[PDB]
Amino acid sequence: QARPTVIRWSEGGKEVFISGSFNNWSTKIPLIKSHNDFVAILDLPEGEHQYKFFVDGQWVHDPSEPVVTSQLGTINNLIHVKKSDFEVF
């Protein structure tokens, strides 16, 4: 079960994308420009996901978010998605 999740890239650049473990590093999703900033909203299942940005042609992490080292040895950002069980009530 997935949540809408806001991802904001605020270190600037001209063209931003995100990819991550949530889609097995299979595709990049564009981030929309808005006042120095790039944002996307992602449908992501509860739990922890690793992710990284493709900014002006370079794979880069957000230095303001937590990071982790992959099985491949890469530095990826980590997001925890909270469970939304029973939030209707």
Structural domain boundaries of the chain? Answer: 1-89
Query: Residues 17, 28: contact at Cβ < 8 Å?
Result: yes
What SS3 class is residue 23?
helix
Determine the Cα–Cα distance for residues 8 and 15; give it in Å rounded to an integer.
Answer: 13
Q: What are 37's two structure tokens? A: 């900033």
Which residue type is seen at 24?
Answer: N
* CATH code reported for the domain at 1-89: 2.60.40.10
Q: Is 22 helix (H, G, I), strand (E, B) or coil?
A: helix
Helix or strand holding residue 4 (H, E): strand 2-9
Dist. CA 15–CA 69, nearest whole Å:
25
Which residues are CB-contacts of 68 (< 8 A; sequence separation ≥ 6)?
50, 75, 76, 77, 78
The experimental method is X-ray
